[PDB]
Amino acid sequence: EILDITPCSFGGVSVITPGTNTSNQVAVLYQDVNCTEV
Amino acid sequence: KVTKFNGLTVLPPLLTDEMIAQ
Numbered sequence: 329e330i331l332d333i334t335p336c337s338f339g340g341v342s343v344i345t346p347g348t349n350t351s352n353q354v355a356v357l358y359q360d361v362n363c364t365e366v
Numbered sequence: 367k368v369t370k371f372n373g374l375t376v377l378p379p380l381l382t383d384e385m386i387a388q
């Protein structure tokens with residue numbers, strides 16, 4: 329049988345954060361992926 | 367009229383085509 333091989337979920341990770349003089353709350357952005365493997 | 371998994375990606379533009387049309 330023939331099995332297609334695909335490199336599994338990968339992508340970039342960006343952190344959205346305001347200035348350090350305001351708050352330390354952050355948001356993670358996983359690029360070009362679905363919200364399933366994360 | 368106008369016409370992968372190796373670490374190379376393309377990021378979508380901030381302004382979508384709908385916003386450019388608007």
Ligand SMILES: *[C@@H]1O[C@H](CO)[C@@H](O)[C@H](O)[C@H]1NC(C)=O
Binds near residue numbers: 362363364
């Ligand atoms: C992510 O996976 C879900 C479940 O299969 C699907 O409903 C959704 O459309 C997918 N989103 C993208 C962007 O592929």
